[PDB]
Amino acid sequence: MGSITENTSWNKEFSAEAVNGVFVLCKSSSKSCATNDLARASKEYLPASTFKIPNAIIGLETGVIKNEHQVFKWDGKPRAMKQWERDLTLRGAIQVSAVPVFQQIAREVGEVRMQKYLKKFSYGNQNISGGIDKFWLEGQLRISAVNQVEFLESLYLNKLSASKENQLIVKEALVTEAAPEYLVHSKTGFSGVGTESNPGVAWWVGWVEKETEVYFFAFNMDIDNESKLPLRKSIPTKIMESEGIIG
Amino acid sequence: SITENTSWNKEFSAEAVNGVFVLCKSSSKSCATNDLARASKEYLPASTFKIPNAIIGLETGVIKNEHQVFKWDGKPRAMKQWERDLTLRGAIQVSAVPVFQQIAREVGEVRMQKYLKKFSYGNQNISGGIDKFWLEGQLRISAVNQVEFLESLYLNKLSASKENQLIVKEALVTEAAPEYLVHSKTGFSGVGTESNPGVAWWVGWVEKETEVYFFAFNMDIDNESKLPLRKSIPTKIMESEGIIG
């Protein structure tokens, strides 16, 4: 990014919901970012299902995922969520955050290749230790909000170390809201409710295309109560609405 | 193969609309329609032509890339919504004719003819002005041919790079929900002349679960107040089939 500046008035939306968290919003043309909290914008947290973005790119690059029309068949064996108990396309698996589909992808990619691509992508602390199918959910991998926006900008510009085709496939799968005047690409994550004195993390990251501008965003918050989960979208939505970008 | 479903006419009769809907599950080899004859009748594509024109612009390099900005020169355009810089998606979404007129001029007649041949696009007749053949010229395409063309695009089987097909696909997203994605494009030739109605279109496809549905709708129109029916009639039919909504 070009610059970052703190805007403490955004804490308004956090205080109203009694949330500890951070929002980073970057405008592409002015190479400028704003955040409610510079310190928290640099703090690093488990990516949880936001990791499906690099995992999908890596799956395609290595040939583990054939293309955007591949169907991931459900075997009929019970899964942790009802929503996952069905055949899924890549978009379907990303959209419902189908953990077991991406655990199998990670296993087939394997540690050496996974390490290589996280280095190429400058993805967080690049620490994948403690189970190839677990690192982004309960392992040692950590990434900051600033690093998420850097990574997403590279994806948007097709500048990651992957084919343009594969970057476009994943970008297509990340669309979550379409309007005549704006398009939103985004991904949620939630690590769980954590333990005593150790909250989980919830994320919403993505980008908005409006007019000829592009805005990259990353939100995270501490969470110890599943009932608070919708705040991961409502707080950043309120901020972007106030900025005139969506709504 | 095209199968008639008489019951779909109820949605047209209610509005006194003359038109056709073609809906195909999985592939263009299995289509349903309210009217066999009109399904294959050819009409001016109007701004549905922005689909092939964007692909051709990318293939020829006239559109340099996914992120090009089409600058407004500050000179009057026929709609205020076109009087601004636009991206490729923005120009498609507001149907910014003058952006695509300049693309067509730079593609040129020789290359435009070549690509419409490769794409099997309607009657492939571009005569009538390189910057207006799809609006007032002799080009004609049917609902069945629109679904075949869209299926090829979906499958990345047009004579174009997969990259360029993917770029145009993203520019066509018009509704995103957890359960389904709609890609689509409208068209409207105008109100026609006496005894010669204009045509309005909505064409596209729906990705739902692991299925895909291709669709094309057209209708005769001679009053702009009827224009919303181009979306509402096919939306009602697709909601009735349980595909969207």
Curated annotation (Swiss-Prot), chain B:
Gene name, Swiss-Prot/TrEMBL: OXA-10
Function according to Swiss-Prot or TrEMBL: Class D beta-lactamase which confers resistance to the beta-lactam antibiotics, including penicillin, carbenicillin and oxacillin, and also some cephalosporins. Confers weak resistance to some carbapenems, in E.coli strain C600Z1. Acts via hydrolysis of the beta-lactam ring. Has penicillin- and cephalosporin-hydrolyzing activities.
Record family assignment: Belongs to the class-D beta-lactamase family.
Subunit structure: Dimer.
Subcellular location: Periplasm
UniProt-annotated binding residues for a beta-lactam: 95, 186, 188, 230
Regulation: Activated, with respect to most beta-lactam substrates, in the presence of 0.05 M sodium bicarbonate.
Coiled coil: none
Gene3D superfamilies: DD-peptidase/beta-lactamase superfamily
A biological process from GO: cell wall organization
Disulfide bonds, paired cysteine numbers: 24-31
Record keywords, A-Z: Antibiotic resistance, Disulfide bond, Hydrolase, Periplasm, Plasmid, Signal, Transposable element
Main enzyme class: hydrolase
Species assigned in the record: Pseudomonas aeruginosa
EC number(s) given by UniProt: 3.5.2.6
Catalytic-site annotation from UniProt: 47
pH-dependent activity: Optimum pH is between 6 and 7.
Assigned GO CC terms: periplasmic space; plasma membrane
Catalytic activity: a beta-lactam + H2O = a substituted beta-amino acid
Superkingdom of origin: Bacteria
A single GO molecular function term of this UniProt record: penicillin binding
Effect the entry attributes to changing residue 6 to M: No effect on catalytic efficiency with respect to penicillins, cephalosporins or carbapenems. No effect on resistance to penicillins, cephalosporins or carbapenems in C600Z1 E.coli strain
Entry protein name: Beta-lactamase OXA-10
